[PDB]
Paper text:
Bunyamwera virus (BUNV) is the prototypic orthobunyavirus that serves as a tractable model for the Bunyavirales order. Each segment is encapsidated by multiple copies of the nucleocapsid protein (NP) to form a ribonucleoprotein (RNP), which associates with the virus-encoded RNA-dependent RNA polymerase (RdRp; L). RNPs serve as the active templates for all viral RNA synthesis activities and represent the form in which the RNA segments are packaged into virions. The BUNV NP comprises a globular core with N- and C-terminal lobes bisected by a positively charged RNA-binding groove, accommodating approximately 11 RNA bases.
Based on a cryo-EM average at 13 Å resolution and subsequent fitting of NP crystal structures by molecular dynamics, we were able to generate a pseudo-atomic model of the NP portion of the RNP. Given the absence of long, straight NP sections amenable to helical reconstruction, ~135,000 short NP sections were selected and processed using a single particle approach. Therefore, these numbers were applied for a final reconstruction with local searches, resulting in a 13 Å average that converged on a −105.26° twist and 18.25 Å rise. To preserve these aspects of the structure, we produced a model of what we termed ‘split’ NP that contained the core of a single NP monomer and the bound arms of its two neighbors. The NP structure was symmetrized, and molecular dynamics were applied to restrain the ‘split’ NP. This allowed freedom of movement of the linker region of each terminal arm, which had already been shown to be flexible while minimizing alterations to the globular core of the protein or the binding regions of the arms. A limitation of this approach was that it prevented us from modeling the viral RNA along the NP arms, and therefore, we did not include it in our model. Displaying the surface coulombic potential of the helical model confirms that the positively charged RNA-binding groove of each monomer is aligned in a way that maintains an RNA-binding channel along with the interior of the entire helical filament. Furthermore, these rungs were too far apart (approximately 18 Å) to permit intermolecular interactions of any kind between NP monomers along the longitudinal axis. Our model suggests that the helical arrangement of BUNV RNP is dictated by lateral NP-NP interactions and does not involve longitudinal NP-NP interactions, providing a molecular explanation of the RNP flexibility. However, by comparing these NP-NP contacts with those within the native helical NP, 7 novel residues were identified between laterally adjacent NP monomers with sidechains potentially involved in weak H-bond or salt bridge interactions within the RNP helix.
Numbering used by the authors:
A (entry chain B), B (entry chain A), C (entry chain C): 1 to 228
The structure:
Amino acid sequence: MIELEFHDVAANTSSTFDPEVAYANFKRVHTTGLSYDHIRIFYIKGREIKTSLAKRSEWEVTLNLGGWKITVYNTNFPGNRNNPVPDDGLTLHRLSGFLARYLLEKMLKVSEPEKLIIKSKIINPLAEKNGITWNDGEEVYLSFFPGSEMFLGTFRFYPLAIGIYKVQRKEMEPKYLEKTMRQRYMGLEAATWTVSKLTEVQSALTVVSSLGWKKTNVSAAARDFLAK
Amino acid sequence: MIELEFHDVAANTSSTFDPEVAYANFKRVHTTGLSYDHIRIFYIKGREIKTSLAKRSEWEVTLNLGGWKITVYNTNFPGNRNNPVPDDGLTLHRLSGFLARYLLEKMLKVSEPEKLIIKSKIINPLAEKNGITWNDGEEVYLSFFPGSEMFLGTFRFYPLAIGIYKVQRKEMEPKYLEKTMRQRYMGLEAATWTVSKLTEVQSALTVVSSLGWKKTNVSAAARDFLAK
Amino acid sequence: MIELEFHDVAANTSSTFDPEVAYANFKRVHTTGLSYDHIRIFYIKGREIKTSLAKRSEWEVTLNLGGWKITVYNTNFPGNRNNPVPDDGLTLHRLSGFLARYLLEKMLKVSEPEKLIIKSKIINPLAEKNGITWNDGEEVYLSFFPGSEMFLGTFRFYPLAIGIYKVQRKEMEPKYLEKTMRQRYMGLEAATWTVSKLTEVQSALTVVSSLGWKKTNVSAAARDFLAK
């Protein structure tokens, strides 16, 4: 006689990481060659990179984002999700966030013409679809990237505010905002900032609800001609 | 000289049972400890329970649906299908139906807040995939379970109506509706209710074609925060 | 270890054709049965033909524009765009342009009463929406058709002028005027006519900005009665 037991559904993936420390490791190791051409490549083909990782079976995959090259923990393969990725890991998710943190810093530590190189080249699919483009503010724009949610202190609650903005107009499910609520704003953890800095997340939501900008590029005689 | 004979294909499994009486036996024996946590466990892992029974070779298997425990005639093993399971038997199929009858009664004999405990906990994979969730009506929702087809009087032709709804949009094969046509609506048998209560099955089909609802759950500070 | 590369966005479809020669081929092969009833049919249902081609998966589709029948390279299906269509090809786009060239010639080589048969029957959706109708000049009217842009010598820069007129009041994106800049005015290529014949495109823009006319048709006793 065989007896065999069955149970309840998951609680989704929680923070099984230190985000500020994982962003450190990324920043230290990877951003050494990394440039705006390589970064835009990651965002643009963000669609395809997510698919191609979910295609492949291997646990350690490299992305060749132009010449720049990153090692990514593939958690996107079916089999591979629910195998804990280290405290220092990169995933598609974390990596996207990490590039977005890298940039939100960049956008607030670099020259206004260097920032225009950022603003032309980097194209954010999630941001662009919901209107938002660079002009609306860098901090707003960058938080549409997934993985931004790990760190809410930098962006000042715009990842959560966006999260909240998608759910209340029925676009994203409540449950992915469980992962967000299990992240830090500064060094404060889940429950504390939840009410302490409620009014932050309110103003941040108010802001990101409206905003929109748009841009175009490419050819050279055509560019010039057309302008007049 | 050896002579040896060959023949035609089956007629599929027919009612080799009394369904109202098999549901009695279930109800009497099993629903004595059985609770909404145990029930949801059966539905949720309905996917895995079907697989795990089809894996195992043994003819009598027990399911440990939380603490609650049921003895199931395994007919799901390859070898084991086409060995008649008694008139009082439980199979995966019958059992699922039997839990769904148990509930359709429950949903119409229990308090509206107790019904909300049902409506949160029990998640029906077959119902959820084709949209349907509790709000659309209990009787509709429960008939997506297989084994519901044994008893058409309780649900009022929704098992057959669903059956019919899957076949006409090419999702299920005609032949599983041969088993359904060999079941009872009330105490009437196959042929009689087929035309007598044709207009029942029509209105029932009309109903179950549209319907959809959805729900989400889990965390506690996150729940509260998110709500506003 | 799998390594896999990602890159930058397209440059849009460029002239992968000879337009004057593709219009030749069209003119030779197709305009042999083609009549004003068939032509108007193409324009009128220009809306639906674009949709129906983008619906279908097949690479060679025929349009049955009344009795008249044309073979069109379907580049409008999702899958099918970015598969080069020959130097002699017809696409929805090219074809529309080609009918518009056919006509702009017709409108300047046919009798003024035959031109009135053209002017009643052919209805140009893109032209009509932005006011323009036949009276404003044939050359103006016909250039609203897409595919007109391939040949700028015939119309005398009205396709580009219109293009420019849509972009500067925010109606069309800059990038479709990259395709236009990669076409010929007479036999001159992109860069040369860009500045050489700048003042052509200026006067042409000045013209097409204002213009509007309108018409009505159908019934017979009603027509007559109403007139008085």
